[PDB]
Amino acid sequence: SVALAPHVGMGLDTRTQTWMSAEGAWRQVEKVETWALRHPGFTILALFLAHYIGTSLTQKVVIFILLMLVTPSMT
Amino acid sequence: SVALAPHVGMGLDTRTQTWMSAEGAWRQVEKVETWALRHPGFTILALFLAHYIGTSLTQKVVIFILLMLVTPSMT
Amino acid sequence: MRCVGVGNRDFVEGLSGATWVDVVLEHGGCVTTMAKNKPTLDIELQKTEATQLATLRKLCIEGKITNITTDSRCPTQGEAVLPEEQDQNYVCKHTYVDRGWGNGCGLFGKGSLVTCAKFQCLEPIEGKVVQYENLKYTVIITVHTGDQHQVGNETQGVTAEITPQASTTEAILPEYGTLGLECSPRTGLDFNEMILLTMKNKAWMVHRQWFFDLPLPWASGATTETPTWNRKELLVTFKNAHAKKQEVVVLGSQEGAMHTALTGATEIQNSGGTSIFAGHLKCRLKMDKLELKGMSYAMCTNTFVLKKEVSETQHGTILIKVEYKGEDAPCKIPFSTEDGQGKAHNGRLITANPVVTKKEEPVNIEAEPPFGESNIVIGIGDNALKINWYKKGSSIGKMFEATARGARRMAILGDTAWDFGSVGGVLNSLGKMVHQIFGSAYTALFSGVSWVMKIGIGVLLTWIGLNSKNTSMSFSCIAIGIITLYLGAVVQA
Amino acid sequence: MKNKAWMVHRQWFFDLPLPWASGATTETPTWNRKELLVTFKNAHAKKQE
Amino acid sequence: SVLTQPPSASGTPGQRVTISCSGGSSNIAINTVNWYQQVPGTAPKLLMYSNNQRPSGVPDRFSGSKSGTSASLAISGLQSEDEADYYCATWDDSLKDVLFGGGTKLTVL
Amino acid sequence: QVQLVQSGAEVKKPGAPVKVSCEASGYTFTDYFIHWVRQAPGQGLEWMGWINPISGGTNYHPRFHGGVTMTRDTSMKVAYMELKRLTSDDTAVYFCARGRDFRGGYSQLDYWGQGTLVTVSS
Ligand SMILES: *[C@@H]1O[C@H](CO)[C@@H](O[C@@H]2O[C@H](CO)[C@@H](O[C@@H]3O[C@H](CO)[C@@H](O)[C@H](O)[C@@H]3O)[C@H](O)[C@H]2NC(C)=O)[C@H](O)[C@H]1NC(C)=O
Ligand SMILES: *[C@@H]1O[C@H](CO)[C@@H](O[C@@H]2O[C@H](CO)[C@@H](O[C@@H]3O[C@H](CO)[C@@H](O)[C@H](O)[C@@H]3O)[C@H](O)[C@H]2NC(C)=O)[C@H](O)[C@H]1NC(C)=O
């Protein structure tokens, strides 16, 4: 494919190993983390957006985590 | 692999268009759209989560849209 | 004894009124059965194969751009056209370019500019399907007769090719009888929509809708000589630099992108016919005619000697290799274990009833001692060989490990794990039905959710359950949080 | 690469995951991080390919 | 672009004669050139299976390399038995096809 | 050893399809290429198209797409090329050659056959 929609989580799994598990386990996460360490500018805006949206620490945390996670994965 | 993390927003602005502006302008939204059309199940879960966490209207809609964007991209 | 030391085996001891026990044969994992009066024999899946592959949606992975052509029209007198554009062999798309006295127009204005290119097939990647009829399953059967060197032997056994036509088969073992096999290949895997995506020298398992969603141009998939592609614009891009001309590039080779894409697909082997590994099949064993050899054999009285070292395998069972020293070819081996110098005789002889077929070379016993330090004797008399052993662990540890193993079985095997090792109990069937409806509703929600996203969703729902008000808090918290966390912990494996 | 060229921001030209070498064109490049490209698959227990 | 090499004459006394191959910025300036000599009327054999590497051709006297847009071959101690047509072929990567040359009628006196 | 028989030369009439068989044994045929280079009398030889036996499709020279077709079989390790249309132009001997899949080796035609010859006339 365009390698943007990996064939993952289809549910039709078996005891045997998949094509690539040791790397696909952390591929997307490592992309997000290298993004975040490269560019901290988005973090300030994400913190502000989570903070000034109606704030209960549950809501603030979930909004901040999602907003900091979505932009890197889906640029 | 390297197919992930394009430097779409890298900021080296230019007047002429880029390598693939036409496709890259919409490929991510295309991935999300085809993921949603393939799998309708996540919509119910996102609606449930937003409805039972969103205190207000705007918080609910923001939570719903972020959840519906992150998961297809994180797939 | 093909089952010894496989790291995935599981004991399925039990029978029923008419003596059937069902078991799901996970590929690469062998199950072992026991009974009060039946021989313990070992079952392992092998080589679920197919024939007569049907091909559809032959994809394209690399292009080739030839015969670059372009046509321009003067501004504001209609769009440019090319008679060559209609043919399906051409990719063509028109942008706008400013046209001037410097490039021969009538007046300054934006004008259409079609540019067409001859897309050519190169290195197609075919994805075939399997007619459900052609699925073929082979199950090997090894009985626990100790031979000289039959420990974990893989060629030894009796094959039983089980196909959906011959759902029921016999199994003529040597001097034991006929083991009956009732099967249900319908619920093995949803092969109504799998596609065998064959790469250069590799082939895989994929879901149907995902395969139709590969963003590459596709062909008819038939055996035609001149394929015609569709959505050809994907593999070719048009470079319009600051609106002066139009050039076309073929966008390289998507091979590595594909190899990175199929991050959750399984593997098969492509060598002539394809033997698709990585599948499970339930089989209702029939123990009707199995009879123990040497039931009436005389129990010999002489000293035994330990040829090979005692060595215990994983999850609590030990191997004893002993050669009889005497004169009774039909001898059967005595056995008894006494811990704390008591008469408890606790434990189980995991092998049915070992017998020395021939004196010269040992027949090797297998047995499972209790957790505590327990001695094991073999023969009879003062010189009777006695072997000490000390198993490490306690009963609660075994219970915890069994529970974890069962959870791993349930998560991967879906709704058929309740059929595993069953007797037909009314409680078991009701549990299977309830778990089936609940799990179907559950997986309907999460069709396509990943490792980390499932973990995060589980955390979020366990939190929303923890702090909620009304009595739905426990149901949501326990059910969804535990299920999602335990699936996030063990998935993609 | 091949007959085409590009301009990419330098900070982004080391973080894209691929094997890399000294670029001394000495005909025997010892590639750093070879593990990233080659992938090992271990079947259900048993052998390794 | 497309490659064109010239036909030329030579003599049986040993002398360096250069079969120059000229191409473009997409076909030979970046890729490995391949040199072929054919005994006329039969199957051509391969003379250079890399840029400057010969598999089993006449050693120590057939050696050449490429410079920028041009590739060249040098022959030393050329006798009569070397009467052959010499071909330079390079892989074009823009048109996704190899680009064989017209041919040299290398005649040796 | 590794070689290509290339069957025997045959000559036909215009307006009919001709076949050129080309078998190469002695090595694993799957990995390597077959190139099908044409050679005219008193003219230079030009290459037309690859065929990957294992999974490959036709990748003709731009001059020859829709003019020729290429097929193959893996069991017998033979590559087939046929001429769907014979004009007066194609009067030459057609070759076979083994090619590598290396980017620098697309032109690597190490081994050649005898050369099946076909000419067209009334
Ligand atoms: C797994 O099962 C196979 C099938 O039996 C075993 O092969 C067997 O190996 C034994 C050796 O322990 C062979 O017996 C010996 O044969 C030689 C002649 O080669 C003879 O001189 C000896 O006196 C003894 O009889 C036996 O013939 C052979 N059976 C065959 C090949 O069918 C194998 O050893 C087992 N174990 C493993 C780890 O593979
Ligand atoms: C795609 O482009 C290629 C060139 O890039 C076109 O090939 C051209 O094909 C024609 C006939 O097949 C060639 O004409 C021939 O020229 C020779 C020259 O000696 C002449 O002797 C013959 O009688 C014949 O007229 C033409 O030269 C050739 N162009 C080249 C080699 O540059 C091909 O036709 C194009 N395909 C299309 C437009 O569908």
The token pair that represents A58 in the structure block: 């549950």
Q: Which chains touch B (3 or more CB pairs under 8 A)?
A: A, C, D
* Region of residue C149 (left: phi > 0; alpha: psi -120 to 50; beta: else): alpha
Closest C-alpha to D43, from C197, C7, C3, A9: C7
Chain B partners of A27 at a C-beta cutoff of 8 Å?
1, 4
For tokens 């680009």, the residue is: E99
Contact C69, C385 (CB under 8 A): no
Neighbour tally for E64: CB within 10 Å = 21
Q: What is the resolution of this structure in A?
A: 4.1
**Contact between C331 and C300 (Cβ < 8 Å):** yes
- Spacing, Cα C150 to ligand 1 middle (Å): 10
Cα–Cα distance for residue pair E80/F72, rounded to 1 Å: 41
Give E90 to chain C, closest Cα distance, Å: 17
Say if ligand 1 is within 6 A of residue C156 CB. Answer: yes
- Residue A30, amino acid: E
Using CB atoms, which chains have 3+ pairs under 8 A with A?
B, C, D
Q: How many CB atoms are closer than 10 A to CB C155? A: 6
Work out whether the CA dihedral A11, A12, A17, A18 comes out positive or negative: negative
Tokens of F100: 């590598």
* Contacts with C308 (C-beta within 8 Å, 6 or more apart), sequence order: C319, C321, C362, C364
> What is the spatial distance between Cα C214 and Cα C178, in angstroms, rounded to a whole number?
49
Cβ contact F74:F30 at 8 Å: yes
* Among chain B residues, CA nearest to D39: B1
Which ligand minimizes its atom distance to the CA of C147? Answer: 1
Please report residues of E whose CB lies closer than 8 A to that of C66: 95
Angle between helix B41-53 and helix A57-73 axes, rounded to 10 deg: 150
Q: Is B22 on the interface with A (CB under 8 A)?
A: no
Residues in chain C with CB shorter than 8 Å from the CB of F66 are 89, 226
Ligand nearest to the CA of C87: 2
Contact residues, chain D, for C29 at CB < 8 Å = 44
Contact (Cβ atoms closer than 8 angstroms) between residue D28 and residue D10: no
Nearest CA of chain C to the CA of D20: how many Å? 17
Residue among C66, C118, C123 minimizing CB distance to F57: C123
B65 contact A CB<8A: no
C interface with F, Cβ–Cβ < 8 A, is: 64, 66-67, 89, 118, 120-126, 198-201, 225-227
3-class state of residue F81 by DSSP: strand
Question: Mutation test of ligand 2: which of C65, C67, C118 has the most ligand atoms closer than 8 Å to its C-beta?
Answer: C67
- Alpha-carbon distance of F43 to E105, in angstroms, equals 11
Torsion of the alpha carbons at C324, C329, C332 and C338, rounded to the nearest 10? -20
Chain A residues close to C447, C-beta within 8 Å:
9-11
Give the helix/strand (H/E) hosting E48.
Answer: strand E45-48
Q: How many CB atoms lie within 10 A of CB B8?
A: 13
- Testing ligand 1's pocket by substitution, the residue of C153, C307, C358 carrying the most ligand atoms inside 8 A of its CB is C153
C237 lines ligand 2 (CB under 6 A): no
Cβ atoms within 10 Å, residue C464: 20
The candidate with the shortest Cα–Cα distance to F119, out of F46, F49, F18, is F18
Helix H or strand E segment including D11: helix D10-13
Sign of CA pseudo-dihedral C85, C90, C96, C101? negative
Measured between alpha carbons, how far is C82 from E50 in angstroms, rounded to an integer?
43
Residue of chain D with shortest Cα separation from C269: D43
Q: How was this structure determined?
A: cryo-EM
- Determine the Cα angle at C24 with ends C22 and C26, to 5°: 160
Kindly state if the Cβ of C154 falls inside 6 Å of ligand 1: no
Contact E43, F115 (CB under 8 A): yes
Q: Which ligand sits nearest to residue C157's alpha carbon?
A: 1
User: D39 vs chain B: nearest CA distance in angstroms?
Assistant: 12
Strand ranges across the sheet with C195-197: C54-55, C127-129, C195-197
